Design a protein around this ligand. Structure first.
Ligand SMILES: [Mg+2]
Ligand SMILES: [Mg+2]
Ligand SMILES: [Mg+2]
Ligand SMILES: [Mg+2]
Ligand SMILES: [Mg+2]
Ligand SMILES: [Mg+2]
Ligand SMILES: [Mg+2]
Ligand SMILES: [Mg+2]
Ligand SMILES: [Mg+2]
Ligand SMILES: [Mg+2]
Ligand SMILES: [Mg+2]
Ligand SMILES: [Mg+2]
Ligand SMILES: [Mg+2]
Ligand SMILES: [Mg+2]
Ligand SMILES: [Mg+2]
Ligand SMILES: [Mg+2]
Ligand SMILES: [Mg+2]
Ligand SMILES: [Mg+2]
Ligand SMILES: [Mg+2]
Ligand SMILES: [Mg+2]
Ligand SMILES: [Mg+2]
Ligand SMILES: [Mg+2]
Ligand SMILES: [Mg+2]
Ligand SMILES: [Mg+2]
Ligand SMILES: [Mg+2]
Ligand SMILES: [Mg+2]
Ligand SMILES: [Mg+2]
Ligand SMILES: [Mg+2]
Ligand SMILES: [Mg+2]
Ligand SMILES: [Mg+2]
Ligand SMILES: [Mg+2]
Ligand SMILES: [Mg+2]
Ligand SMILES: [Mg+2]
Ligand SMILES: [Mg+2]
Ligand SMILES: [Mg+2]
Ligand SMILES: [Mg+2]
Ligand SMILES: [Mg+2]
Ligand SMILES: [Mg+2]
Ligand SMILES: [Mg+2]
Ligand SMILES: [Mg+2]
Ligand SMILES: [Mg+2]
Ligand SMILES: [Mg+2]
Ligand SMILES: [Mg+2]
Lengths: 116, 155, 70
RNA sequence: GUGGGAGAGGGUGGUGGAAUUCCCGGAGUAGCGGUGAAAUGCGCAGAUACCGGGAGGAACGCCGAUGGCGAAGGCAGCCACCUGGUCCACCCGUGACGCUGAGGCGCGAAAGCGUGGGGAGCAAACCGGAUUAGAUACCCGGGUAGUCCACGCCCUAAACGAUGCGCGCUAGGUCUCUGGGUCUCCUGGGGGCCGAAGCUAACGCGUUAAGCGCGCCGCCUGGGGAGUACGGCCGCAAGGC
C-alpha cells in the first residue's frame, strides 16, 4: 500500500533466534519476520534454516509494497547470521550493501553472570 | 573398517544379461545359500514382466531400481544429551544397496502366491512409480526436508 | 602489508588538529591501530593514543564506524 | 644545587562518546525471551525487531602490552588546577649528617556498620520456573540489602614473589621500558627469560639470590583440641589484635 521500492533490512541474529525487519530509507519499518513467525517454536528458531525462512518470509512480504533495492544491516553473532544474509541475496531483492552494526559497549554496564 | 577403505566386492556379470546389477539383485533374493533357486525365481519373473507387458525386462529392472534410489536419508548423531535425526545425502553406492534390498523386501510383503509373481509385479509397479518399494523411498526423503532444520550438522 | 610510519612524512605526533594525517592511524572502524600496524615506538604510540583521543572530542576523528563487509 | 626526563602515583573540579534501562513520539504485527530440552516471565492496554527526541546512573572499547606508576592496599576516557615519588647528566655545595627499628602514629582490596543522599546494570537473602530419587544447588525468569557518592567507623585476606629492610661482593647471553652518550653499540635505572660459580631435600634460585658476608627488626619449635576458653585492649555492631 506504500510503494517504497528501496530501503533497509536489519538482521538481528542472536543464539536463540534470528529475526529480520525491513524498513523504508528513513528507517521506519515495513514488514518483518522471525524464527517464531514461521512455524518454529523452541530452540529451532535460532537455526540457520529458521534464519533462512525468516529472511525470505519478510523478503516476500516486502515485494507486496514493491521493494526491489535493499540495504542490509546486521546486528549480533548468531547461528544463521550469515545464512539469513545468503538467503536475502537470493530473495530476488537486489542487495545494495552489507554493514555490520553490532553494538559493542566501551565497557559500561555490568553483564549478567552468564556473560561473566 | 578402522584401518582401510574396505573396497567394494566386485560381482560376477549376470549369466544371462551380462549385467552385474542383475547378479547383485539375484543375491538379495537368495536365502540360505540357494543361488540356483533365487535365479529361477528372478528369471521366471522376467517372463512374467515380458509377457504381461510387451517391454524388455532389462530396461524395466533398471527403470524400477532408478525410481527407488533415495537422494537423501536421515542419520542419528549424538549431540548435547539425546541425539538428533540429521539429514544428509546418499553416496551412490548406498543408493544401490537400499533400492535393491527395498525391492525384494517389498515383494515378499505382497499378496501374490508364487515368488516370481510378486517380484515381477513389484518391479512393474516400481518402474511405474508406485508400489511399496517407492513408498519407502518417498518416505525416507520425507524424513529429510522435515528435519531439514539440522542441515548444519552434516558431518 | 605496509606500515603507517613507513609511508608518511615528518609530522607532529602531538598535533590533535591535523586530521588528514591522524585518519591514517584509524582502521575501517574508528579503532586505533596496534603498533604492529603503525610501526611506531613504545613512546610514540602512547603519545598518539592521547592525541587521537583529543581529536575525537573536538569531533575531528570518529569514535567508532560501521564495517561495510561480511 | 643546577639542568633535563618518563608514568593508569594521589586529591579536586569540569567534561566526551559507545552501551544497558526507563519515558515521549513515529512506524509496524504475533510473538519475544530463554534452555540440553523446557517452563515461570513478558506481549492486543500492541512487546520483541527499526528510526528519532529525552532522562538517569554506572563503567571507560580500541590504544593495551609478557608495558608503566606506587611503600603496600592499589591506580585505565579526556581536560585543567593542587600535589607526592623517582630516574639521568654536570662533579658545583654540606662533610658520616648513616642502616635497621621493640613502641607510637598514619595508610590499609572486598565485604560489613552508622547518618544522609543516590539507584541504570548487576545481584547475597528471598519469590518463582526447571532439573532431580530429593535440589535447601549449579541452569532459567524476577528481585532487597549492597555495589556508586559524602562524612564517620571497621583493620581482616591466597594483604603472594606464600621470599622483611639496607649495603658490599660473585661469568655471561637475550628480550624490554626509560634516561644519557663519542648512537654496529657503550653506559645508567626498572621490568622479563636462559644460564657461570655456588646454594637447595628436591622442584628450583642464580648481579631483581634462594649465592658469599655484615647490621638490625619480626617470627618458628609435632598434629588434633584451637586462632577455641579466660583475662585484657579496641569496636555502635559483626568482630579484630
Ligand atoms: Mg530460541
Ligand atoms: Mg550480549
Ligand atoms: Mg564478550
Ligand atoms: Mg563470547
Ligand atoms: Mg569476564
Ligand atoms: Mg622534574
Ligand atoms: Mg594520575
Ligand atoms: Mg513506543
Ligand atoms: Mg500472559
Ligand atoms: Mg531515574
Ligand atoms: Mg586489554
Ligand atoms: Mg614498580
Ligand atoms: Mg596484586
Ligand atoms: Mg612531577
Ligand atoms: Mg666536590
Ligand atoms: Mg671542604
Ligand atoms: Mg611499626
Ligand atoms: Mg579498610
Ligand atoms: Mg568496601
Ligand atoms: Mg552504607
Ligand atoms: Mg538480573
Ligand atoms: Mg538470578
Ligand atoms: Mg540424581
Ligand atoms: Mg608455610
Ligand atoms: Mg601472611
Ligand atoms: Mg638482564
Ligand atoms: Mg639514544
Ligand atoms: Mg637490568
Ligand atoms: Mg652447577
Ligand atoms: Mg632461573
Ligand atoms: Mg657488580
Ligand atoms: Mg643481595
Ligand atoms: Mg604469632
Ligand atoms: Mg588432621
Ligand atoms: Mg600439641
Ligand atoms: Mg580429621
Ligand atoms: Mg590450628
Ligand atoms: Mg579469626
Ligand atoms: Mg588466662
Ligand atoms: Mg575476649
Ligand atoms: Mg564495649
Ligand atoms: Mg554472625
Ligand atoms: Mg572472623
Amino acid at each position: 500500500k506504500r510503494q517504497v521500492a528501496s530501503g533497509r533490512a536489519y538482521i538481528h541474529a542472536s543464539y536463540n533466534n534470528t529475526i529480520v525487519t525491513i524498513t523504508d530509507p528513513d528507517g521506519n519499518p515495513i514488514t518483518w519476520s522471525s524464527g517464531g513467525v514461521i512455524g518454529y517454536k523452541g530452540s529451532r528458531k535460532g537455526t540457520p534454516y529458521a534464519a533462512q525462512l525468516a529472511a525470505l518470509d519478510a523478503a516476500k512480504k516486502a515485494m507486496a509494497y514493491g521493494m526491489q533495492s535493499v540495504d542490509v544491516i546486521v546486528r549480533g553473532t548468531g547461528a544463521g547470521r550469515e545464512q539469513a544474509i545468503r538467503a536475502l541475496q537470493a530473495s530476488g531483492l537486489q542487495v545494495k550493501s552489507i554493514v555490520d552494526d553490532t553494538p559493542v559497549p566501551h565497557n559500561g554496564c555490568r553483564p549478567k553472570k552468564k556473560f561473566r | 573398517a578402522r584401518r582401510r577403505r574396505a573396497e567394494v566386492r566386485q560381482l560376477q556379470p549376470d549369466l544371462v544379461y551380462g549385467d552385474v546389477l542383475v547378479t547383485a539383485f539375484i543375491n538379495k533374493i537368495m536365502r540360505d545359500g540357494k543361488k540356483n533357486l533365487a535365479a529361477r525365481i528372478f528369471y521366471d519373473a522376467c517372463k512374467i514382466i515380458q509377457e504381461k507387458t510387451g517391454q524388455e525386462p532389462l530396461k524395466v529392472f533398471k527403470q524400477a531400481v532408478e525410481n527407488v534410489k533415495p537422494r537423501m536419508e536421515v542419520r542419528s548423531r549424538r549431540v548435547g544429551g539425546a541425539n538428533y535425526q540429521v539429514p544428509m545425502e546418499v553416496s551412490p553406492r548406498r543408493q544401490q544397496s537400499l533400492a535393491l534390498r527395498w525391492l525384494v523386501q517389498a515383494a515378499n510383503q505382497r499378496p501374490e502366491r508364487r515368488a516370481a509373481v510378486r517380484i515381477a509385479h513389484e518391479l512393474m509397479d516400481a518402474a511405474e512409480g508406485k508400489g511399496g518399494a517407492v513408498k519407502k523411498k518417498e518416505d525416507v526423503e520425507r524424513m529429510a526436508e522435515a528435519n531439514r532444520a539440522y542441515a548444519h550438522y552434516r558431518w | 602489508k605496509a606500515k603507517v610510519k613507513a609511508t608518511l612524512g615528518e609530522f607532529d605526533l602531538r598535533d590533535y588538529r591535523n586530521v588528514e594525517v591522524l585518519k591514517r592511524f584509524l582502521s575501517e572502524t574508528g579503532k586505533i591501530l596496534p603498533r604492529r600496524r603503525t610501526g611506531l615506538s613504545a613512546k610514540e604510540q602512547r603519545i598518539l593514543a592521547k592525541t587521537i583521543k583529543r581529536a575525537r572530542i573536538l569531533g575531528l576523528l570518529p569514535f567508532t564506524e560501521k564495517l561495510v563487509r561480511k
